[model samples]
Target: SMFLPPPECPVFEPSWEEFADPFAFIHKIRPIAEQTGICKVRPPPDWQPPFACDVDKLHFTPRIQRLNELEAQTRVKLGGGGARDYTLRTFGEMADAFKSDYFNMPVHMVPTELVEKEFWRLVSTIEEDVTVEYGADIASKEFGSGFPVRDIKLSPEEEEYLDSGWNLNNMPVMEQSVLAHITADICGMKLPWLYVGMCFSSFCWHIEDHWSYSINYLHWGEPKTWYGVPGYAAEQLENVMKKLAPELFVSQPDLLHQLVTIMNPNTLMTHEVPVYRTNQCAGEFVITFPRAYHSGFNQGFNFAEAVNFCTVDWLPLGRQCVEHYRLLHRYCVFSHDEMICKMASKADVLDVVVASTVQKDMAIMIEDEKALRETVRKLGVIDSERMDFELLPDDERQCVKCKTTCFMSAISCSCKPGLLVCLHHVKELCSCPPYKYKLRYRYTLDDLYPMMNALKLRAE
Candidate 1:
């Protein structure tokens, strides 16, 4: 079995005076941190959420025995598995073995170091332990989050944090919290997902969907051992993984691209990639920055709640992430341009700082779009008249070919009615004579910059 060195992630204990501005505080200490990727935050001793809830009362659908089986099947499906003898076990036996003695014991009393060692062992010798149950997200379909309710059993201590910007359910207007600003209907960013973990239960190595920030609070639980890579070294970590297991990186059918893949921390370190670790115990928060790859497993039974958020700071990275996805030819959840444009339309109500930050990113977005249009026009596609994209019904504005939200697209042939296709699929649409190709514009570069300038003035 592999015996890797223990994690060395930085830990920060700040006073209320120092912790007043969350982002400012994080930026202040970033330069002096021992490790860069992930940091453990212990609030002032008096600051803690009053965790009063019965485990049985919280309901969630158990994802038992399926995740492991899927991985093995995927290997075989991808032709990586030779005639290795694979024994299929019943779910009952698999569940029992997964729990073992670890689940029966008091998790807080168990040594975290011992759990880390056993975790590495299981990961190292994959054949010996095929029974593993970890990382289950109990979402809105099963049970909603455990906070921000009207008349719930929450102490005064819990109430303080309940209305804090961190609360997922409390989306007060003028809220500086980026996550709260991105509502469910507008951006699919709300709805905190609850997690349940037992011994060796795990989350795989992956960044947030759009290089967004993710905040995880250990509501009450045994500590979870985490391994993280900094945002700057994201590509380096990917290169290392590609060298070690090319199969995992090989292009798969769009339907098969699941966001779960695990590898040993020792493997990353052996490749000379900087990896950091931390044990996130009860009442602590873990924040993963843009493009930071993180993975971890629990020592014992635990409950944690986490949510994804985006702010004005994330706008530029969001654009870069979309371009990265384009290279991979992956399906996007929502268009980056669409989100930026949506925020721009509502700049009047935005927080002053957020408005200023967004205006700068929107300027960059307009410039990039201009360059792209020029390059495409050189390829013989002609520009047509402008269209009010926001005026069109949501379904009407979708790309006819890829189904992406078509805020800016090519609209050839009024013969086809209101059909439109994105720039990437310009050649695919119309399929008729060359004279029929007509690219549409949402807003001219001149008009776009003025709109952004108006936002700046409004922010002022």
Candidate 2:
């Protein structure tokens, strides 16, 4: 049987007042939209941002894509052949023609439902195998963001929208965003990624790093269809996917920075994980919440921009996500504890709500670190030092076994010059006895208690 698309997700059209603050708008819609995992938002009729780039001049070296489900994972770095160096107009035209010919109809004339069914059919047929190409890269000087961000040749209208809150470029650095204060330069996680899509070009199931929220704006051209599973159902979907693709679930700590694989939404539907779908057309926005599992493809040729951000509400969830990663032995984009303490160090300047949320999460972190340090104490590793964990590069202080970035405390050994491990994994720090280990920590119980006072003082 062919696939029947899932029920559509929620869509909202906010008034100009409601749309003035993007963060506030997202928070306003969360009560309703979070239930569906992903929702489409249409700006007021006049919220248009001018997008005028010469397609011929904008260029990218695309990764060749396979049509087979799960095959894409193996080829993450494997070279793709056939064509290279594609311009915006060149690939756009190819997509338009392919979709038109495949359905024997014009691109826009093809029904969204028909493309959905045909997509499910061709991907599984084996005999009807399709190999496609697509581009995904952070906005660069060569190909800038869809929204205006810099001083370029622009009309007054383009300049008017240049500083708009909806611009993805500004989201990460916004006052409410926790990532805004990090001293470390993890640009890859902070930048906006531009995606140029064609017929059959798709992105696999994935979530934002640190389980943060993501907003994708389809600037122009054809619709980009999305399938999303609510955050609460994430584990249920993970369980089903693991049973089918266990190899992908295996611990590849080194390659854990990037992990994704193709899976049919129908399979999840069969397993009873609630799925929702939407065709995010030009000028629309699709927002995915923390831990929401989403995957989608373009209905035809299109261009889009998306950015991941962590809000005050996401602080607790971010810490929980890092703990989960520790269990899985996965690499982290950045230390949650580090980000929390950084906010604490700058509590006076932090937004009141953000200070309150970070204080709460910091309380939990201190409580856990205190008890875990007690566990290490019982092991008789008495030597300790006030080490500045923030100064050590991320790779310098990770638990050798679990690879969790250490912040509150870590165990090190003179036997091994610089290697360290979390107190929970104290025994893994070295082959030498526990008695030889030294505790490295950023704060003492007394020192830590005072840090929260600033957060408390500022928040109230």
Candidate 3:
């Protein structure tokens, strides 16, 4: 119950609006941020394991501070008017209760004013230490943990404002801003922003802003994945949110009333994205379009650290990405459903193939990469030239030829160095030999129909 507060629930100190273009603000001060190793992280591949990182290879010393000490240091930094130490003890104690089920999913990590002050003091120290330790060689280490590089252009006035604003919870905003800059640059979006934390087992599906949103969720020891609802499923999203998160009825009364009167649960508005990581490194990222209600699940090994970096900035990615955004973000229940329409417009052969392929999700009811890969291989996609064609529609195209039900996304496929085609394609390219067995899709209208009948879905 006390797993800390969901990132979206927090009330930020020095509200995000106060900082002019949060992304820009952090970017302006990138140099100082790097000195503290805040933005200098060497992110591993998506879903990589934590142990994969060689601790010795990383330069930042891992000093474990105790709980009380962390609080004491936090007080000194905030009250003493300086950056506070990012002590392990404070982090451990503060987050400890959340780890237990009683405080697991519902709590928020409310950073006190003191915590924010300490953060600023810590940054100053980081900058000073970088200059002293690395000197001119600073950027040379480049991606190393100990190195500090400045990409943000912070002004004197902004620096002064932040110096004074360093309260307990306020400090992460600087990092949050930097995260926004990087994420915005990646996805090209702009809109409302809120950071929601999901345990190794939680995920979110909300659409905000006219543009698509990019999420930078950092993983410490555990791993997780994301799923998006294609633009056509927008209707299904509204009803489902209500069923899954009934609390939203009270928390977001406006949306509740809308759901009560209008809105189709079966109509699609977002993409079903399964963004996952297995041997997750320290940090991993996921992005989605606005107003899309995709689901996520807790997965992976035991975890010790996790953080979410959320942002939206408007930048043109390309007509395809942008057009898709417009289609999904549109408020129409089904009138302007381009994604679903386009998907449905395909030839009969394609539909049959898509249907058949989609049924393959049943091979493994549980979530596991190794098991998933094995299942796909049995279906025969282990190595095929069409591996990259896993795009739902693209695979639907292939299914017309293969004949058996095998949607590309439904196929347990994977990408590796030597082999290009994944297990899904293996089934598509040829019927599984004696060694392989074809898998039927696991998810279906029948299985999902009950929920629709009850309409016991959550839409928050």
Candidate 4:
């Protein structure tokens, strides 16, 4: 019985007043729930968003997942360019069949506790090479969301939650999101993904892109058992995993290559890293904090909708995450500085709190970049020029040494053609000595002042 489920994380039952606006409710509880990483919220008894879908007509192509513990695997790399048609197949029946076959019980008749115990047992047994199939994809035409989305014909009941503040689709684009003002094309992290879960199908231990907060709602189905590590203990859990599953910790060429893997919570617990657990049932919402690490499995057959969002409170942590990615030489989904500056351009339209938070984050960005640039200047590479990093179509991303991309500034050299290094890695850019390289900047410290001032004026 090593599978003593870790103690459950926090759960809240918001009053009708608190449940009316999800964003405001999140901010109110953030001071407490964030301490626990992933917290569950149960809405008022009458807050049910009606669910009516003909499982026979709706469909998705099933995706495969392995049951082996700590197996090296890539994160759910959802979406792609071009219209690569996936031959859609009916999911409900196909999914229930898989669950029934796996445990030799009627899908709905299976107890959730039994499913959880079986999942842990199967993964622990090396002799059983079990592979499970599940479906995860965005709210698209064929397999749309349980929540409402516009630009599509809808029934009156389906239309109810469209403008409801609790809708997952609305959370990312609302005024409070730092990701809202981003002009860059990284979009789906904001979109809700529908997951068709079968027995033992799971997500690996990982944090959201840029360490953003994520909220998952079980639309209607069996429970999803989750294990969460608070933001503070994320690195502690990572160190333990790296020590055990060293293969997954190898030098990932870029973020795309940064594979994730699942391990027993007991492994993490044995290393003394704080861990928490929960079994998310239908109609409940689980929200994960800034850098918190989470992974879980579907106890039986289920459907869940989840999406990532970045609030002003997450702005500081988001910047910290980008810096960490740079040290690890991982590719970034988007530049943290560029997004901050983008919000600055329309300061008057920003949420008052978002403007205030962005200004504070920008202060640190300005002060740090100034010191970094100043030290590089003293190294004898005084020649400087502004580079329109935003205009370049080369996807001219990533540092020559670190691969985390150049946004605010970088060092380039005439001798080293087609190479650029982030200011932190100026020495790694070339062996030709410091003076041979020139500092390339998106803008000077002077240009940053006016941007920060605009946010100040708006916040005032």
Candidate 5:
């Protein structure tokens, strides 16, 4: 199989088909696994260990294609620690990293001066007096929410950083660690891997690779090699990656942990196809999720040690954990769950909004939830709140009058009760064309049950 097999006695050359069956050889080892005192999501016999060599294990092309899609799609960008390109593009330059306005960009961006506030928020503001750290100067924080990269889309600029050819200044690991901790606090979820590290490119194998949880080592500095098993060609590598993409980058630790635990079995059957490292002169980094028995062997050559951290965990296979290898096949056939389809829907919307947000494109199409709903409901719909809509104004408005759309799509939109029509929209209504607006009822905080549940328990 294209995946790695766990290291154990009687190492059989298992086929992907054989390994894909969680009930196959797993039953043979349940007693041994049970004796180790590890919590089993399934019976001990069914548990399969997850193995990854390093971030480079995901360097294959199939992974990149899927990863790229996740990084570029999102309806809302809740800023803070995790990377959401929509928010970054809209608000990064406007705000400081942690002003509640930025969804609290990773705590690492916590200016050295605000260290105390970070500690207070992360430690003191707990659900029930939990200790968050040990040593005073520099020690692991006690309470940490670990989210992975690949959960969200990267902006084109961020993608450039991962491509390895553009090699930007990578963020520091300690900063990543800070983000790791604060992300946990913000979302009330614990990281699957305690400290998988972030965007700083560096040396060493398995630095952050995980067994069951594969990662995207987005490059902007060097190229690398990923050896694959028979039935799959290296060309299809990115496909494998897209399957694992959304699972990697979400900032919600609980959701990520559940996904990781579910795939722990089948992942153990595959073989560890080694990845060839590249010697890029520029700095680059990768977002990694760690597993046992994996390592990275950096090929020795003249090249600067690159840097890369991870992204908030987000990927395609994230929600379909228990489904087994079927998920891979489904992804291959282009069959996707509603969420991905919804992402596509939003992407189409983004294109229209882009001109307004893009540098000086200046085609605004903004509207608030209230006014938008009011306008759309004025048309024909049973329940405006629940209905999906595409809105067009009665009178025409020039591109200049469409600022309302631009404002609503901002990384951070404050939807107070207000009818925000711009100078151009009103003027155009007299002599020009009507405005264009679209709305739809989709997932909400209530729909995010897993994380919401975890958040409630966390506060408890």
Candidate 6:
């Protein structure tokens, strides 16, 4: 099979001395491979998670695809990249072979090397082929993870990382960090998706939700190929994609944007966009930094798990992501301001380190809100009086105009009953007199900062 040489990605192996603090180690390595966007890690040789799950018993609906059909469909819209064009489809006629069905495959039945070989052959060939890559998102509820789950099953090795709060399976109480604390119950952050890949099945290039970091573990499988562009070069990659595939960014109704499309790394490198690659195998882990754009497919039938997370370092990025969504007029999964306020409300019970970090981000949020309110007021808008932001249900308090989840400051008017507009949409709320524009806030900047101080004291 013909092959394009895979570019090298940074790899790390930390000694027990260096791996004392996983997060700290991760932070320390950022300066080096952060610019590269992706890196692979080989944990201490003896470190291993117990892989015990009944594959035949686990059941889930798998997303099936006809690659040849998808290829022509994507090609018509996305244009050419590094991959060679194999075939195009007629309007009604099915032109070629199709690959389908990727879910929890019996790993033991098929040897890893066979899967790897078949995977390479699949990617190397342009002909239509039947491919199956198995995977699912957030296996905690459905299929338990190789890492132990409380109230279900656990091993001593898994227990060792339990209190560390970084264990992949210790989702419920991993409150040492901002991301781990975010259960789907509190916020939609704690999702660990499982992946089983065979030859040819792959992921399209995209950034993580909220520009957060993502950690992926290849539990036991053939190598999973990856390509990544650093956070700083995200825009550059976008520009390159825009140049090649303008259809992707063509403005859509309701802030819709096309994401997850294939792009040639060759084109990226040609344009001076730095790209890197790594082959993550069994027991290996890969981490993609905040805003890093990454995509890859597996070398063979393999199982991998991944999840998105945030840290104190991610708060600024979270704010930036919300603003980016605003620019694109996109919907948000949850309000960044709401999350900060929630943490502030429960500062007394928050992990002390988390409290300190949330306080800092809260300060930034307050200042930004202050500036926005000032800008809106200068547009002849006035303070409408305070609204009890906490009292309202999550769905009720969104901006009537743009649908931004409002917390800090919003423009309200008597002309529209029970309606408010975000600062960006103040002019669109109603034809009401500018004097009617009331800048509603949950807390004054003065009160907000003091609340942050209270959090600081509690953290101490």
State which candidate has the highest TM-score: 2
lDDT of 6 at 335: 75
Q: Give the clashing pairs for model 6.
A: 102-133, 103-134, 119-199, 134-196, 137-193, 138-192, 138-193, 384-438, 384-439
> What are the per-residue Cα lDDT tens digits for candidate 2 across 273-310?
99999999999999999999999888888899998898
Clashes per candidate (backbone, < 3 Å): 1, 0, 110, 2, 100, 9
lDDT of 3: 0.28
Writing each residue's lDDT as its tens digit, candidate 6 over 70-130 gives 1321211211122322111220011111122232454345444454445445443577466
**How well is each residue in 76-126 modelled by candidate 3, as lDDT tens digits?**
010112233322233233333433342233223322222222322332242
Q: What C-alpha RMSD separates each model from the true structure?
A: 6.2, 2.1, 24.4, 2.4, 22.8, 7.6
lDDT winner? 2
Off by over 4 Å in 3: 1-88, 94-204, 217-219, 242-281, 295-460
Task: State the lDDT of candidate 4 residue by residue for 18-48, as single tens digits.
Answer: 9987888999998887777889999898888
Best-to-worst TM-score order: 2, 4, 1, 6, 3, 5
lDDT at position 416, candidate 1: 78
TM-score of every candidate: 0.82, 0.96, 0.26, 0.94, 0.20, 0.81
Kindly give the stretch of ten consecutive residues in candidate 1 with the minimal lDDT sum.
Answer: 72-81
After superposing candidate 4, which stretches have Cα over 4 Å from the reference? 79-89
User: Each candidate: what lDDT?
Assistant: 0.65, 0.85, 0.28, 0.82, 0.24, 0.67
Candidate 1 segments whose C-alpha is farther than 4 A from its true place: 30-35, 65-109, 138-142, 151-158, 168-174, 177-188, 252-256, 383-405, 410-421, 428-434
For model 1, how does the per-residue alpha-carbon lDDT over 1-460 read when each residue is reduced to its tens digit? 4567645778888898766566666556665442466787777787765656543444444443232311321211111223322111232233334455544644455578777776676565647554554334434533556555546476667778766554545532225545444422433345566666667767778887778777788877577778888888899889987776665675554423543556777788888888888889888888777788898877666778877766566778887887787667555555667656666777788778888887888888887778778766775777478887756666676666665556654556666778877777666667565456677888878777777876798788
lDDT of 6: 0.67
